[PDB]
Amino acid sequence: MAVELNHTIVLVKDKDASATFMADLLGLPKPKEMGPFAVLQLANDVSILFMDFRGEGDIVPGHCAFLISDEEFDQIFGRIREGGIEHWADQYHREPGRINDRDGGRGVFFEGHNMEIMT
């Protein structure tokens, strides 16, 4: 296939709080705001468009997952395990304080939108 996912809208309680937190943690530039969206651009020709929503939001095992460097993981995990960010090895948030080693890589789930970083 050639079709690409170009952008996807993510509903969260506070779009500005979500986007800046993720850009900071992921080491990305300041998010750009356009209309009702806070835009987080990723490297693979895709952006996440955060939008304010009062309702549900995210339920496990739902999540958004970011593929990163293992050098990036050790830094991001350090800040997670520095700034007191609750985290889990699993998408169901049943294993707090652990990382997984799924594909011989490393991975961790965190944050109220559900996130995942993986190598």
Structure tokens at 72: 């990036």
- The yes or no reply on residue 108 touching a copy of itself (CB under 8 A) is no
What is the dihedral sign for C-alpha 91, 21, 55, 51?
Answer: negative
Q: Which does 21 bind (CB under 5 to 8 A by kind): Fe ion, a copy of itself, none?
A: none
Interface residue with Fe ion among 42, 46, 60, 65 (CB under 5 A) is 65
Applying CB under 8 A, the span of 12-20, 35-43, 78-86, 94-102 interacting with a copy of itself comes to 35-43
Residue owning tokens 């304080």: 97
Q: Are strands 115-118 and 64-67 parallel, antiparallel or unpaired?
A: parallel
Task: Report the alpha-carbon distance of residue 118 to residue 101 in Å, rounded.
Answer: 9
Whose Cβ is closer to Fe ion: residue 4's or residue 56's?
4
- The yes or no reply on residue 5 touching a copy of itself (CB under 8 A) is yes
The reply to whether omega before 36 is within 30° of 0 (cis) is: no
Task: Report the alpha-carbon distance of residue 12 to residue 2 in Å, rounded.
Answer: 30
- The yes or no reply on residue 27 touching a copy of itself (CB under 8 A) is yes
Interface residue with a copy of itself among 16, 24, 69, 102 (CB under 8 A) is 69
Q: Which does 16 bind (CB under 5 to 8 A by kind): Fe ion, a copy of itself, none?
A: Fe ion
For residue 96, what is the DSSP state? B
Give the residues lining the site for Fe ion (CB under 5 A): 4, 10, 16, 33, 45, 64-65, 70-71, 74, 116
